Amino acid sequence: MKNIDKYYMQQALTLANRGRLTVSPNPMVGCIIVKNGAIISEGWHETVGEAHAEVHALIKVGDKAKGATAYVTLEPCCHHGRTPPCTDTIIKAGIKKVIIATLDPNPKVAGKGVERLKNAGITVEVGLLEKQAQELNKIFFHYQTTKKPFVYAKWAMSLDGKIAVNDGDSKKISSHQAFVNTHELRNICDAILIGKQTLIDDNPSLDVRININKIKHPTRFILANHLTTINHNWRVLDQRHAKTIFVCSKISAQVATKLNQLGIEYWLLPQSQHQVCLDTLLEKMGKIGITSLLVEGGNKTLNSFINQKLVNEFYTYLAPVIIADYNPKQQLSFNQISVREDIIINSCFK
């Protein structure tokens, strides 16, 4: 074999990807300790608050790593005083060579761990499979470089371009795979955002209702230009599972007193372009702790977010359904789907 370092780094990125659904707001970090050509360690960051990848990799091996080589997909943290730094564990273990894929995205921290390792004579190489390791951590890299959340836009539409259905309809335009994808994106994201109209129409609960090892309910954001009416039967007022925050520009005194009694925190922001200031809202969410944001439903909310170019990735759930003046929507059946530059779709039923 001639590309051994690339092989070990690719295995490290696979281990890092193993923690896809449960690591936010911490990044994806994998680690491999190789001595005498044999891999004797494995580690990956799996849950927030637990041991880091380097510590989880080096505790199990004891002190047999003396003189080994470390493949770590991210720069080890040194300035972080919450836990003993991974550089200290690496130095006490006795690693001679450390190979790092990417530097830390934060400019004030970037290069500190490399220098701290190189004080002790450890050999440091940075830049192996850098693009793949930056694409793996797109959410964290974007949040650290911009201090604004990563935005997901996801909605479902019929074959003729209608999102909502007529009154009395079953309100199902998605299959089971769309359900699974939606709840996985809910588990990944740190927040969930809807509109006031969606809340008063659908009355949704924004939790996770499928099987994940660690269920992580996102923070609920309710966007409303004017707050005048508060309903007792709203399901978002239950604070048992997650937290609900009302974003507003003009709030009534009675509504404010009712929210203060209910314990719901409201945010007052200026008005811009027929909406609240979305840039200020993104800055505030970045400052308070949310890393990635998910926008679901509502033509007004989706159009407002699209018009300001704040969306980073899209998701569309297109069903074989025709939405018209029909009280019940009429199902269809696809015949030919030819996927190319532009999708060409043929439907036979109805």
């Binding site: 074999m1 001639k2 590309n3 051994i4 690339k6 092989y7 070990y8 295995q11 696979t14 281990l15 990807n17 193993r18 005498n36 050509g37 044999a38 891999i39 494995e42 795979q177």
Partner: protein, 428 residues
Amino acid sequence: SSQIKQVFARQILDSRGNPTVEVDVVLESGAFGRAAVPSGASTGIREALELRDGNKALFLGKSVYKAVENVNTKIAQAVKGLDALDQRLIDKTMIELDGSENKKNLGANAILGVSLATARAAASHLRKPFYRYLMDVKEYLMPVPMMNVINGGSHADNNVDMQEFMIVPAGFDTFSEALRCGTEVFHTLKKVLIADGYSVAGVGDEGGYAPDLPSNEAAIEAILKAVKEAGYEPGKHVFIALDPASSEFYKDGKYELKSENKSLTSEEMIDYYAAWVEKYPIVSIEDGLAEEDWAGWKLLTEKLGNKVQLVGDDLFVTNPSILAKGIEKGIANSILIKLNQIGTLTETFEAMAMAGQAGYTCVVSHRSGETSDTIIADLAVATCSGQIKTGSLSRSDRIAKYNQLLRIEEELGENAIYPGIKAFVFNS
């Protein structure tokens, strides 16, 4: 989604008319992968074991119904729902489920088939060639093939103590000219062996001739005159590769050369090999000594490690532990890699990475009970260790690998290079 949806297995026949396990894996996105397991050893203490029914009313005793049932129940309900792009996860899951060091409970064929089928399904899911899925680099090395032209004592009744003689076409700029040279030399060797009044009609398991030669010197001289009769110069275009497999004629510490009626010790056996080394353009000695005679192996690596390439097949049996012991003791300077001997893809990668960092060269190998699957060609291209042992030019289970190599060489026109003589790292 790339999660495993269905795993199925069936009993098919291999190239020797013997049952073997063939596994299909289908993911949630519809990606499909298919893998057949070449036949290996069903008993021993060193390699991973293969499970067979032992029913006389069945095929002979070689029905593999238990392995297929073990797949379809245990492995199918164990690996269902796992992400197919994490090969380590499925591999270690099967290792933990089986619970034995030699894979006795489930058999190595079942586990190897599941792992290879999962890898092919994952490669098809990403819309990639399999060698590009294994290793995604820009520049690739095309393997130098060793072509088994003459078979010997174990494979035929020849009165020849040696086992295999091969030709190495290492004096060319591309793989196409090397393959043409191999084909022309094969045909001219048939004509030459016919001219000398030898029995040539028939073919062996690996496509090589098995004539009733009188001695090994006659075999080497016949190969050399077939090389120089086909228009190529020996020693510049075609070299010779050996395969004694000396475990057969080793008894009580003595190498019994029955063709010449001699009983030799170790050091004089290396002396004979050296006489051959500067007698002929021979650069390979695979299993030139027994696997129990490690002192002679150290002597051979000392006094011949800088003149030829010493390969170990029964010595290291594609085992990371035995290979590590050989590295720390300093024995041989090459290893022959077989997928069936270890049972999983990740352990194969670990063994070849160990060999690469130790400074050895890796040779991807084939088995006697081969199938129509051509995975070893993609494996040899992907890891950029250019040497391969996939048989001679005489039958489809040996021709499919060369056809795959030709397709790879034409689809990587700028970025595939052929290391003709530089691929033998034994000097400087």
